[PDB]
Structures are given as structure tokens and as C-alpha cells.
């Protein structure tokens, strides 16, 4: 017996929707849900979505609170909808998918993913929930995540990290590295070889390799010497050039992190969403060097070094396609006299 | 188990809240409540109140659908709150009272009128509901309506008309004339002898006496002759003077109705609420005669004639207090040489 | 090159979207679209929909301005979406369907109805537009309307009336009676034999037969005598019983229209949408007789007389199913000693 | 000492702003202003403007309540702002001008029209207010209205009618016909000779000449015979042609009024504002004949007959410019073999 | 061809408006602009302005992204409007000026600053844009900024810092120190001798002189001794007195910065805007010492020492006017027995 007052009761008493019985008094004013606590209104939820306030409230309350794949991965894999859960997009403060299956009466297109409406949609299945590996097996389109092996099916080892309540982390007390499976029109797909983005923050950046430790601790010309990166434009691409009005390069999160410790800078996230490649309007506070669209990718420095060293440097300009987070990311490679001039995630 | 979805189920299936079990999907957007009917949103309620949308929706759904006293009467009797019902104010599109008793968890100050919080409030009791005459006897303050006698209680015969779902009518298939009782500080108060306003509309005005039929059919000078009203300023007070820029008199609804048939006019209801005396910014469309505050009362013409003929016409100006709808309405009487010049519901 | 300013230019200069080039300055504030006309804002549209303001504005501007089937018919036929047009629902002030095909970038699920997303949806096709009869033949699900014969397709003759810009009318300068066709799962479905509702208003009701003229002019007992309706409970069903607190019968629009001329009454349309059977919370102003859910159908009196006279009157209570507006409407027939007691569109 | 609570006090006690001292409690919620009346909120104003709610409330309260020129006239004369008053536009429910002079602290550009900011603006002056004729003489740009002669200034006799609180009327108890004066760049401009629109409604249309009485009473062919209008296309232009899907002609309000009595029709006012020529999306309910943009002008039939009979009928198509309400209205005249085919207010 | 969808396309693809062709689907809900990115809504802009949402969105997209003068400077110089650009006020999240010239159709008063409407307004001209030094030369009122010299015109050297996308900085890769020119009624003004505020933050405070380094590193009595500031009330004015309930002095940002490293404190910015002098409701967390209006100015400590040492200390209380950021800032100087008691930016 689903209700606004019951969803609110669960939020107040259980921290989220937990199927518990009970009702608390609720008031809705504009885009905010309130509850009366000893005669005064306490805010429970502020609707930042394009859905009706009470509908967004129920989907947020019914969000998956287990470590789940990051929305960028699900998007890159073509996920349209989730099976009997809500993947909450914490970067957008909104549900990751428009419709639901067996979650909310206003957004449900079906109660079970076996309904014919779900057949053409890529449904997300969670092998950690009972019977979901079998629902994937019976589904025409879908993406499956598991913690262990699946009989017959060959896995694609996903990223080490997952999102737990909006916190991207590599689990120690929980499993965050999943096996990924995908089916298009009833056929189990062979997922491609892929690099993964590291999903780190600019403020809390931690190196994940000896090369990353050396980049953060060494001086620019010491690191380029140690790692034989002469002629690969790391000075421009990774370190950044703040000498002209237009900020040069600075496309790797580790380079932004190194800079951030010394001089702060403004990053305007003009398209706020989870994506493999992020675009920022950057303004360097120390120099006044700036760039309207500065594409940034967080690759492990070793993976970026491997990608750039595996390219033909004899062309003036070409598109270099790299598989990252299961999607095809186009890069722009510009060379001159056999040396790199620039390499950046292609702005389109 | 009260919920928004259950209140909505009742509205859709029963025309109002009827305590039936069930839920329909609801969406709230801004100040409107919608329900999904075959994949599309259908508006159920638009909040015109100062309460939260979902709260106003539940109080409107829980409105008393039996003939009830008109809000002006309840206001004139000092009613603060109703016992276990909602008097919906259709003139304001809002609950007639701020708080409720045993109706809605958001607006309830008490579940029963016997709670000590209700003691200082004048609670409205409906003798047609079981145990409500007893609750009135136990109440410190209150107004009671009944269809018959209550042993020991001296009754006040109320108006012939009552409001049934916003329609003011004199019942033929239902009883609309009630006995009224009031209590202030544990003590039954004797309600005063009173005139009652007729609660008629300008558009559908119907005479309720031979004098009212004669006013609408006869010419000004022959009605004044027939009813011996010479020297009582009916030409100014009732008929209206449209010869000057400021509209003269026109304080009785029957006079406005007679005028309306011949020439239309705009009545700006700048304080839209139910009241014994109504104030309008009137603009006569034929002449351009206008008045910012034109007080209008709908008294039966015979009752108005009786009031004006029961006054001493030897003073230049005095306040004449008349009990109408249980409240004391002050009129302003202006005389000259023993004749009336003007008589109007005195602007406070 | 679709834009808000171009949609607004078309509204201002052509009365609706007409594909004309040009832009006018627009301002959006809350749920209203304004345009600057000589330095002042003029309201162009007020959003009464659950869609974003600018989106609802474009769909309203792109509404079909040719006589189209009434939304009740489309709903009864299972229409989910329209092919390259917008059926505007004037009873709801909103699009009749959630999504569009080739209309607006925000609501489009496809540019053409041939896209695989449209296959499971019942798409509405208009044979008056080029290539739409063919698109219906290629559609898995759909409803087709035509002004003439389609080789091979067995037609269903629809109602005489259609909606032209919110005005329901029987065309004289335009064709409003269409041939209807339906397809479910690639298979043409034979539309059932049906009665049609007349789509008349209470305020401007006009009889459409000698029996309807006789009902409105003759007294209750002489009409029942002339048409041999003795023992069919027309006194209760059609005329209405206003003697008790609960209003008895009154389920045919013609009966409400006859009553309306003599005594006015309030009809609360608590589910405001177009439907074959309408539900109203009725309050009779003369008597105070009322009913929370009074189902009303507008059938031609001859069609209602035919339905009631074609029933077996030997059962106490049974469901009588009648096909009206292509949908199966269940009625409740209550008899006693071979005579009708009541017959009403059964409340679901 | 201007305040929201004082503006509200004036509205409640005087029907509008009257400079009286006092305060009432006010609450603002969304776009509505409320006041507490005996413990409950009563709506005083609903903001339909693009200004902040409290600002629109004060300008509406401070509206000119004397008969003023109709907004179409002021617009046609180039009025940008009013001197120390607010012309309320009742067709738009908004102030007729963006800014004020000596009215409201939020919208004031100046306290007096003598301030240099007002010099390039055409300020409206009211000769009925003390010192305003002098302020016009000192103004660089302006429009002046007077009830009599101004020594030296050559007057323009305006329309008989004016707007008194939204009611357009020809005054009997007040003066509504004004003398008009205009100044552009310090120089008095001679206002042109002009026809005036009659400002009548479709619902309450009243003839203002023997020709207008004859048009409404006589049949089409006998009116055209009596007034020698053969070959002037009155059948198309004035009467309207409802035989084809596109409604033919119907550009004079009297023709729409004659039609309205027999058959009703929908007029969609897609640009709701006061203008000399009005544009409507018309749908005829009887025939289904319709037109997206049907320009309508309310000229006295004699004035229209004079205009059409004063044209050379030897050209196929030409623009005929006529001065109406001080503005130049371009008409489109289409002839064939010396007879009129169509004549309509040319769609810009 | 300006549109909402084109402005949105530019924001998404270029980080701001760049005149690029293209359209993205947009939805407006309340005060937020969204765009569809792979079937989900992504927020592009939240309107914090008093302008319509779509209008504020276009002005924000069309903001000047080059280092521009800080809004306080432009305000102090009397700038009313900018020539063909938008100075975005990042302290208010709104345009710095009401109207625009050649930017947006809704806010434009003119397309070119040469139009007569601009003559009485102080237009801001940017010498870095072609032909703007000549538009200033031809303009009646204006402020001009240049990077280099202007023939004939003597410059006023502005502050070292400018705002680049909301980041106030002293440029190293871009020029931020401009030459200022001003014209009032066609006459090139001689701008006054002025001090400049340093525009530093409380958190990221960096000293800009040996005296400022000494203030932050030395103990109160060591610094006052070294700089011979005995008898100048630096203990009260600069350091702050936190011993009583009312916080004493603390009017210089460097003093707040020194305090902030040791003990944190709440600064309530009750008038959030850019101004030479800032007012804060300060509460010291360590002591509970507080002040409702604590005026703070960020002057270079050497400039403040120079101002205070250039005053006559023989009066009890006088207003000391100092030119800071081209405006006249009144200070209050209180002395006793030839020594300073307090000196603060005068609260009016
Ligand atoms: C405080 C400043 C303006 C210093 O330049 N900005 C930041 O510290 C910062 C860091 C990362 C992202 C974003 Cl948006 C701002
Ligand atoms: C349009 C005019 C001004 C014509 O006189 N007014 C009305 O029709 C009218 C009648 C009764 C009440 C209200 Cl408010 C307006
Ligand atoms: C004001 C009253 C209650 C008078 O009977 N009702 C109406 O005039 C009326 C008529 C038809 C429909 C609706 Cl909703 C109301
Ligand atoms: C309901 C219909 C379509 C019936 O013809 N229209 C009107 O009653 C009507 C009359 C005048 C103006 C407007 Cl907008 C509508
Ligand atoms: C966290 C506290 C409450 C500690 O006192 N405040 C701050 O750190 C702080 C600093 C500067 C300005 C503002 Cl508003 C707050």
C-alpha cells in the first residue's frame, strides 16, 4: 500500500525506503517535501529533478543503497532502465533512468522485466539480487553485473570502483569490482577490451601507481626524463601551459591535481553529469590563463602513457579512437617532425 | 491509514473523501494535484489556499457535503474551528477555519474536541452527527446546530437557507433551517433576536414577497406611493442615483438587481469572502457613475422597510445598530427636516 | 531550425505554428509564455499541462487545426500517440498523448512512425495527410481515419461530429464523419457495431430527433404515454427524482437539459477529461437533492429507448454491456415484477 | 511612508490606494497577495504581470480610477509612460507602461516628469490634474488630454468613449470625450483627421446608427439593396462566407455580432491586448468554417461604408491607408471588373 | 537567428555563447534551464536574477569572458550600461546592468551605442574591441578601458587586478591593469587621485608588501613598535577587540585574515554585492564577541597606514573623506588627547 506518507515514514525512520509500515504527516511546498516533527516542519527532500516533487521523492527514497556501477558506465553500455531498483544519479540529483520497473506507480512501465514492454530496452540486472541472473538469461536486451562467475558466460572485468550512496570508492568491506555481461537482441555480446577512468576528485587525489607517485613528487623535467617521455608533449598535455591567455593542454586529472596543490583554479562544470570525458570552463587564478572548453579525463598515468606511446606520430592531425569505460572515445592527435604537439579528448 | 494516494482514490471513485480503501497514482506540480488516467495527467484539484497543496487537497476532499450554515453566520457567531469536519468556504476556495479536529494530521490541533487545546476555541458542533450535542454540552466554547429540540437548551431559529456544496438554497428534499446554540466560557449564551440576509445573487435574483415583486415590476414613484415610503430616501438608498460622478446610495441587493436588468454595471469584489455586508467598487456602464466602496446588504425589502420606518428621523446623524445574521451591523442614518437623506451600512 | 522564438513568431503572426521563418522576443515566467509588443509583455500561453512550459507551448502551437476525432474516441480505440501531429485535448488544456512523432525535439520518441520504437504503440494516422494510409499498412499497431475508401480495408463509419479547434461540430463546410480502421499486432481488427454519444452541452442543448423534441416539449406523463415507455423507469432514469436527499437517477444528458431550463443545478466535474460516460457531483439548487457520483451519458433519446427496450426484464440485477464510442460500457439493470426500477452506466 | 501593508490597508478600506494611513497584515504566496480577516487569508490580488507580485499590487492599487483614454489610443499616440498615475491595462491585467513617474519606488524612473530622464519619453499628461497642462508645455515629448480648451493649443477631438475602471463607456455622469494634444521633440504635432473604433463587445453589441439598426434587422440582400452597396462585396467582407473550409471575410464587428445571434462561434484571441485592429482564430460552430488569422475592426457601419465607397475600384490590388484611432491602418483592396472582391485590414 | 535552443547549443558545445549555429532540446522548469543529454535532463542554468529565466540564461551565456573591471569600479564610475557585451556580476549571480546594447532582444535598448537612447547613459567601452575607443570618442557619456595609450587622452591607471569569469586576479598570462577614461556630457573628465581596494579573500589572503608580511608574522605589540604606530588604535581598528560583547573595530581585511588563522568566525554578508566597503554581521566563534554592522575594507596595509597618519588628530569626531576605487568613501575619525580612538568606514 504505497503512499507519500509511508515513503516519508520510511525516510524519517529508516534513512531510506525499507518497506516498513507507518505514516508521518507530510506537506509539499513548491519543490520541497516537509514533515512535521513536534509541531515544526523539517525538510526531507528538495526536488532538483524534472519529475513531479512527490514522484522524485519516492524514487530518491527507493534508490539502490548498495555499491552500484557509476552512471557513466551504465550510459556507455546503453542501459535504458533498471530491473526493480532505482540508480540514483548523484551528479545530477536525479534518477539515472526516466522509467522504472516494479518501483513507483507513476514511473513504472512494467512490474517485472519479463513484460513485453521491456524486451526492446537494455535492462540493468544485478546478480546480487535473487533471480536476476536468470532474468538476464531470459531477457532480449540487458546488462548484468555479478560478484562471481556465471555458468557458460564469459565475463568482462569492470572497474575496481563503484558508487555507494554517491561515494565512488574501491571497496574493502564490500565488493565494488563486478563482472559485466551484455545482451543485444538475445545474443550475449563480447564486450570490448577497455581502459577505465579512475573517478578521482581534484581535492582528494591519491596516486594509484609508482608513476603517479613520481608525477606528483618530481619536477616536470625530472619525471619526463625518468619515464623517457621526451617528445610526447607532456609539458602541454598533462602539466598545462599557463603562459598565454588561452590555457594550453591540461587534459589529465592528475595534472590538474598537481597544479591545484600549488595554485588554485576555477573549473566551471557547464554540463553537470557523469561522463568518461568531462568538459570544464577553466580559469587559472594565479596567471589568468583560461579555456572555455577544457576536456579532462581521469586515466591512470600509466594507461595514458601507454595510449600516447602506441600511436603513429607521422601524421599532422588524426582522430585516435580509444575504448574507455566500454565506450569509444575519440582523441585528437597533432604531431610535427615525429613529435607530439597535442593529444586531447576530441571536442564535438 | 491516511495518504495522498488514498484521498485521490476517494476523489476519483466517490466524488469526495468517503473512507474507501484504495490508491491511485498522484503527481503534484506547483499548486495542482494530478492523477494518471490511462497514461495522461488529469487535474483533480488546484490549490487556491495559503496551505500546502496536498494539505488543502485533503481538506477539500474531507469537506462537509451536507447542508451547512453559511460561513458568514459561523463567522458572526465566533466559530474558530469545526468538530471532526471541514467547512469548505466556496467564496474563498479555502477551508473556512485554519485548524481541524480529527480530520487531517497536518492541520489537526486535537483528535477529539474534548482535548484541553479546544477549550478556549469556539468549536462548531453538528447535532445531526452522533454524540455532537453531548460534546457541545461538555465544550467550554462552541456553536451547535440541530434539526430539532435539545432538552433544556433554548433554541435560536436560524436562516431558512444553508450551503450545500457551495449552493445556497432553502431545502425541500433536505433540512436547511437549523436551531442555533452558543456557549461562551462554559455558559450558554442567549442568541439575540435577528434579521437574516437572503443570500441571493445579482444574476439570478428572485423576489421573496409581494413588496419585492412590486419593487421589481412597478416604476420608482408608484412603488414609493403604494408602500407609503415618501420621505424615506428610497430613490437614493434603494434605487440609486446615477446622475453624478459619485454613484449615490444603492445599498440593497434588490435595487442593484432592478438596475442590472436595464443597464449592466461592474461590481469589483475587492474583499472576496462571505459577509453580512458586502463592499463593492461599482462602475455603472451606462452613465459612468461610480463608487469605490459601495456597501450592499441583501435584506428582504419588507425587513429593510421595517428597519428604516422604526427610526427616529429628528437627528442630523446617528449610528443605528441592527442585528443581522446574529451580528450587530451599524448603519448611518442622516436626516433633514424630519425626512431621511441617506441610510447605509456604516463603513468601518 | 526549431526554436521557442520561432514558435512564438508563428503564434503571433499565423495564429498557430505554420512553419514560417522569423523570431519574436519571448519571456518565460513561471508557467506563462509572454512576448514583447511595443515595449510591454503580452501573454501568449499559460501552461496547464504537466510538461515544461516551453514544451507545452510548442505542442499547443503545433496542434492539429483540422477537424479531428474527439479524444474520447481515440482513447476508446487505444490510441497511444499521433503520427506527425498533436491532438490537443481542450477538455484538459493539454496534449492528448505524452509523446510525439516528428513534432517536438523534447517529446519525440521518433521522427517517423516507421521507427521500431513505435511498433508496440497504437499510432494514430490521418488519411487526409499524404502517405499516412501507407504508414498505417506498415504499422504494427494503429488507428486510421479517412474521408473515403481504402482498397481492401473494411471501414467503420465513425460519429457524424469531430472536434475542430476544441469546437465539437457536425461539419457542413468540412468533413467530420470519418471511416475508422484499427490494427493490433500487425492484424487489422474489425471494429465493433456501436452507438455514438452525441457530444452536446448542457447550456446549448439541441434535440436531434422528433422523440427528443417531444421529450423537451411534452410533460413527463404524456411523453411516457406517447412513446409507450410505461414500466421503463424513465421518471427515475431520465427525468430524475429530486424528492429525497439523494438525487435519484438522472443519467441521460437530455434529462439534465430539460431540468436545467426550469431549475438550475451544480455539476462538479471531479475528473475533467473527455469520456463516453461522465461523472458529476450534482447538487440541485431548487430542492437540495444531491448525488456524489452521478454518471451521465449523452445518447440520442431514441438510442437509449432502443437499448432499454432490448433488455430482458425478468432478472433482479444484471450487467448489461452496450458498445458506445467503440468501447464496452457496462450498465446496471435492476428490475422488479417485470418492470424496470433503475438502469445506469455502472460505476466502476 | 509607502509600504505593502499600507497599500493593502487602502485596498481593504477604500477599494483602491487613497493615501490613507494604516496597515493590515499581508502575506505573499507565489503570485498572490493575501490579508488576514478574522484569522483567515482573503485574496486581495493575483499577479498576472511580469513584475514582482508586491510591485504589481501597488501599481494596480494606484491605478487611475477616472475615465481615461483606452490603451489602444495611448499606444497609437506613442505613449511610453504616464505622469504621476498608472494607466491600468484591463485587457492584459497589467500596467499599460513599464515604468512610472512619482508612483512606486520600484518602477519610478523619476519623481517628476520635469526630470531629464523623461525628456525623450512620450509622457501622458492629464489636464484634469492641477499643473499637468503646464508640465506638457515644458515636456519635450508628451500626449495631453483635456476636458476644455488650452489657450494657443490646437485641439484634436478624441473618441466619445473612455475606460472607467475597465468599463469602456460614453459618459453621461462623467466626461469621456477629451481634447488630445501631442508633442514630439519639443514641437506640438498636429494630430491627423481620424475615424474612431467604437469599442463594442460581441456579446452586448448595440447599433449606433439607422444603418447599423438596418444591418442587424434586414436580410443580407435587402440591406445591400437599401444602401446601394451592390458590387462592394459586403456578402464576403461584412456578412462572412461560411461555405468553404476557410471562412471568407468577416472583418467588421457588426457582421460578427449579426452572425453570433443566429449561430455561435469561437474567437481565439491569440494576442490578448487592446488594439485598433484585432486578430482572431475563428471557428464557426455551425459549419466548421474557420480562419487562423481573421482581422476584425469595430468601425461604425456608416464609417466603413464611407471608406469603401471612397476607393478607386479600377486596380487589381492595392494598399488603402485609413487613419483610425490616430494610427495609419493599411487595408488590402482587391477588385475585378470595377467591383470589390475583398477589402480587409492588411495582415502585417 | 537568436533562439533559446541556439543559446543552449552554444553553452553545451562551447562553454558559453560563441555565435555557433545549432540547436539542442531545452526544457524550462520554474527558474532552471535543462537540456536533454541521452534521454535525461541535465541542468544548464539556475536563474538567481529578477529577469525571466530564458532572458537571464541568454545574458549569462553572453557574458564577457575576458578580464573585465570589477563591478564595484564600474559602479563607482557611474557605468549604466555596457557597449555590446554583458558584465556578469558573479557576487549577485546576475547581470551588472539592467539593459544591454546589441546583446539580447529582450534587454536591448539599442543595437549600437551611437543611438540617441544611449547619449545620456554612461556607456562602458572596451578599447580591446575594435572601434570602441572611437565610439567612446564620439559618445557623450562613457567610461573607457584600454591596455595601452590613447592619442591626446591622459589615462588614469586602474587597479592591478580584474575579474576573469568571476575570479579576481592580477594577470600574468593576460593584462588586468587598465587605463581608465571617463566622459561626462562630451567632456573628458580628469579622474581623481585614488587608492584601490585589493579585492582579497579571507581564506586565500596573501600579503602584498613587507608591512603586510610583518603584520601577519609579528605579534601585535612587535608590529606596532616596528612601524611606529603607537597612538593610532591599530589594536582596536586593525587587530580587533574581542574582550566585550560588542566586537571592537576589525575594519581591515588583513586583520580579519590574521584572526581567521587562529580562531574562525561567522561573517553574515547581509547585502551581497560588490562594493568598495563591505558590511558584515560578524560573530567571533572563540569569544562570542559580535557586531551587527562591521564595515570592512581591503586596503593595502601601507595605504591604510598612510591615510590614518595623514589626519589631524586634534578633533573629537569628524568625517574623513578618502578617494578609494574612484569613489568618495567617508570614514569616521574619533580622537582623544591627540591619539586615535577609532577610525572606521562610516556606516550610513
Ligand atoms: C576558490 C577558487 C575561485 C580559487 O581559484 N576556486 C576553487 O578553489 C575551485 C576548485 C575546483 C573547482 C572549482 Cl569550481 C573551484
Ligand atoms: C462588463 C461590464 C462592465 C458591463 O457592465 N460588467 C458586467 O457584465 C458585470 C456584471 C456583474 C458583475 C460584474 Cl463583476 C460584472
Ligand atoms: C450556481 C449554481 C449552483 C446555480 O444552480 N450552478 C450553476 O449555475 C451551474 C450550471 C451548470 C453547471 C455548473 Cl458547474 C454550475
Ligand atoms: C463554445 C463555442 C465554440 C460555441 O460556439 N464558442 C463560444 O461560445 C464563444 C463565443 C464567443 C467567444 C468565444 Cl472565445 C467563444
Ligand atoms: C564555520 C564557522 C561557523 C566558524 O566560525 N564559520 C566560518 O568558517 C566562516 C568564515 C568566513 C565567512 C563565513 Cl560566513 C563563515
Going from N- to C-terminal start, the domains of chain C cover 1-65, 66-191, 192-348
> Which sign, positive or negative, has the C-alpha torsion A288, A291, A292, A298?
negative
Overall size of chain A counted in residues: 348
Q: Which of C291, C318, C336, C339 is catalytic?
A: C291
What is the edge-to-edge ordering of all strands in the sheet holding C327-336? C317-324, C327-336, C339-345
Round to whole Å and give the CA distance between C18 and C10. Answer: 6
Q: Are the C-beta atoms of residues C169 and C162 closer than 8 Å to each other?
A: yes
Preferred mutation among C120, C122, C140, C184 to probe A, highest tally of A CBs within 10 A: C120
What is the edge-to-edge ordering of all strands in the sheet holding B339-345? B317-324, B327-336, B339-345
DSSP string, B261-314: HHS-EEEE-SS-S--SEEEEEEEETTT--EEEEEEEE---HHHHHHHHHTS---
Round to whole Å and give the CA distance between A104 and A81. Answer: 13
Round to whole Å and give the CA distance between E298 and E205. Answer: 11
- Closest-CA residue, ligand 4 atom 15, reads D266
Is C288's CB within 8 Å of B173's CB?
Answer: yes
Round to whole Å and give the CA distance between C46 and C57. Answer: 8
Q: How far is CA B197 from CA B160, B296, B319, B327, D193, in A?
A: 10, 11, 20, 11, 55
Max CA pair span of chain D: 76
> What does the block give as the cell for B286?
451606462
Round to whole Å and give the CA distance between E303 and E323. Answer: 12
Q: Are the C-beta atoms of residues B294 and B279 closer than 8 Å to each other?
A: yes
Provide the strand spans (E) within D77-141. 81-82, 88-89, 94-95, 100-101, 108-110, 123-126
Determine the distance separating the centroid of ligand 5 and the alpha carbon of A18, expressed in angstroms: 37
* Strand-pair category, C81-82 with C123-126: parallel
Q: Are the C-beta atoms of residues B80 and B122 closer than 8 Å to each other?
A: yes
Q: Which atom of ligand 3 is nearest to the CA of B204?
A: 4
Provide the strand spans (E) within B147-262. 156-157, 162-164, 167-169, 179-184, 187-189
Other CB atoms closer than 10 Å to residue A332's CB: what's the count?
A: 16
For residue D188, list its beta bridge partners: D183
Q: Which residues approach ligand 5 with their CB closer than 6 A?
A: E 202, 264-267, 285
Provide the strand spans (E) within A61-171. 81-82, 88-89, 94-95, 100-101, 108-110, 123-126, 142-146, 156-157, 162-164, 167-169
Resolution, in Å, please?
Answer: 2.3
Round to whole Å and give the CA distance between B160 and B315. Answer: 36
What is the edge-to-edge ordering of all strands in the sheet holding A339-345? A317-324, A327-336, A339-345
Cβ contacts from B onto C, under 8 A: 90
Q: Are the C-beta atoms of residues B198 and B298 closer than 8 Å to each other?
A: yes
Round to whole Å and give the CA distance between A300 and A198. Answer: 6
What's the burial of A42, exposed, middle or buried (CB within 10 Å: 0-12/13-18/19+)? exposed
**Residue among B13, B39, B173 minimizing CB distance to C287:** B173
DSSP string, E139-187: -SSEEEEESS--SSPPPEE--S-EEETTEEE--SSS----EEEEEETTE
> Does the Cβ of C167 fall within 6 Å of ligand 4?
yes
Q: Tell me how far apart the terminal alpha carbons of chain C are, to the nearest angstrom.
A: 48
D193-218 in b/e form (b: 16+ CB < 10 A) is ebbbbbbbeeeebebbeebbeebbee
Nearest to B248 by CA among B344, B180, B171, B175: B344
**Residue among E18, E67, E172 minimizing CB distance to A286:** E172
For residue A40, list its beta bridge partners: A37
SS3 A261: helix
Q: Which of A62, A97, A183, A251 is catalytic?
A: A251
| Contact partners, residue A53, CB within 8 Å, separation at least 6 | A28, A30, A31, A32, A33, A45, A47, B28, B29
Q: Are the C-beta atoms of residues C29 and E56 closer than 8 Å to each other?
A: no
On chain D, the residues whose CB falls within 8 A of the CB of C41 are 49-50, 92, 94
Task: For residue D205, give the DSSP letter.
Answer: -
Q: Which atom of ligand 1 is nearest to the CA of A283?
A: 5
Give the rounded distance of the alpha carbon of D42 from its chain centre.
Answer: 32
Neighbors of chain C with 3 or more C-beta pairs under 8 Å: A, B, D, E
Q: Are the C-beta atoms of residues E291 and E284 closer than 8 Å to each other?
A: no
> What does the block give as the cell for B26?
498522484
Cβ contacts from A onto C, under 8 A: 7
* Strand-pair category, D142-146 with D123-126: parallel
Round to whole Å and give the CA distance between D134 and D122. Answer: 15
- Closest-CA residue, ligand 5 atom 9, reads E266
Q: At A318, phi and psi to the nearest 5?
A: -150, 160
Q: How far is CA A139 from CA A132, A221, E48, in A?
A: 10, 54, 46
- Binding site: what residues of C are annotated? 291-295, 342-346
Residues of C with CB under 8 A from a CB of D: 11-16, 18, 27, 29-30, 34, 37-44, 65, 67, 164-167, 169, 171-174, 176, 204
For residue D287, list its beta bridge partners: none
B277-291 in b/e form (b: 16+ CB < 10 A) is bbbbbbbbebbbbbb
| Contact partners, residue B221, CB within 8 Å, separation at least 6 | none
Round to whole Å and give the CA distance between B310 and B305. Answer: 9
Residue D236 appears among annotated catalytic residues: yes
Preferred mutation among A288, A290, A293, A348 to probe E, highest tally of E CBs within 10 A: A288
Amino acid at each position: 500500500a504505497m503512499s507519500l506518507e509511508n515513503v516519508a515514514f520510511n525516510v524519517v525512520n529508516k534513512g531510506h525506503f525499507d518497506g516498513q509500515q507507518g505514516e508521518v504527516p507530510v506537506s509539499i511546498i513548491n519543490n520541497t517535501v516537509y514533515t512535521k516533527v513536534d509541531g515544526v516542519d523539517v525538510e526531507l527532500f528538495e526536488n532538483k529533478t524534472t519529475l513531479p516533487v512527490n514522484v522524485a521523492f519516492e524514487l530518491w527514497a527507493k534508490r539502490n543503497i548498495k555499491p552500484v556501477p557509476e552512471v557513466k558506465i551504465l550510459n556507455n553500455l546503453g542501459v535504458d532502465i533498471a530491473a526493480n531498483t532505482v540508480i540514483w544519479d548523484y551528479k545530477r540529483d536525479a534518477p539515472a533512468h526516466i522509467s522504472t520497473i516494479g518501483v513507483c506507480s507513476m514511473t513504472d512501465i512494467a512490474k517485472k522485466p519479463t513484460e513485453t514492454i521491456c524486451a526492446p530496452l537494455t535492462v540493468f540486472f544485478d546478480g546480487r539480487v535473487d533471480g536476476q541472473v536468470d532474468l538476464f538469461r531470459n531477457a532480449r536486451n540487458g546488462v548484468l553485473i555479478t560478484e562471481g562467475s556465471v555458468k557458460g558466460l564469459q565475463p568482462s572485468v569492470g572497474p575496481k570502483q563503484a558508487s555507494l550512496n554517491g561515494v565512488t570508492l574501491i571497496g574493502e568491506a564490500v565488493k565494488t569490482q563486478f563482472n559485466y555481461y551484455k545482451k543485444v537482441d538475445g545474443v550475449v555480446q563480447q564486450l570490448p577490451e577497455t581502459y577505465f577512468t579512475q573517478s578521482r576528485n581534484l581535492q582528494e587525489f591519491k596516486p594509484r601507481s609508482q608513476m603517479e607517485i613520481d608525477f606528483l613528487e618530481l619536477a616536470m623535467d625530472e619525471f619526463i626524463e625518468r619515464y623517457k617521455l621526451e617528445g610526447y608533449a607532456f609539458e602541454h598535455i598533462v602539466y598545462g601551459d599557463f603562459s598565454h591567455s588561452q590555457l594550453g593542454g591540461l587534459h589529465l586529472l592528475i595534472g590538474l591535481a598537481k597544479r591545484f596543490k600549488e595554485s588554485p583554479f576555477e573549473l566551471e562544470d557547464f554540463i553537470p553529469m557523469d561522463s568518461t570525458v568531462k568538459n570544464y570552463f577553466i580559469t587559472d587564478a594565479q596567471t589568468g590563463s583560461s579555456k572555455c572548453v577544457c576536456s579532462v579525463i581521469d586515466l591512470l598515468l600509466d594507461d595514458f602513457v601507454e595510449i600516447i606511446k602506441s600511436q603513429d606520430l607521422s601524421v599532422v592531425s588524426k582522430v585516435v579512437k580509444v575504448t574507455i569505460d566500454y565506450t569509444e572515445i575519440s582523441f585528437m592527435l597533432w604531431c610535427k617532425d615525429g613529435h607530439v604537439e597535442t593529444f586531447y579528448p576530441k571536442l564535438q
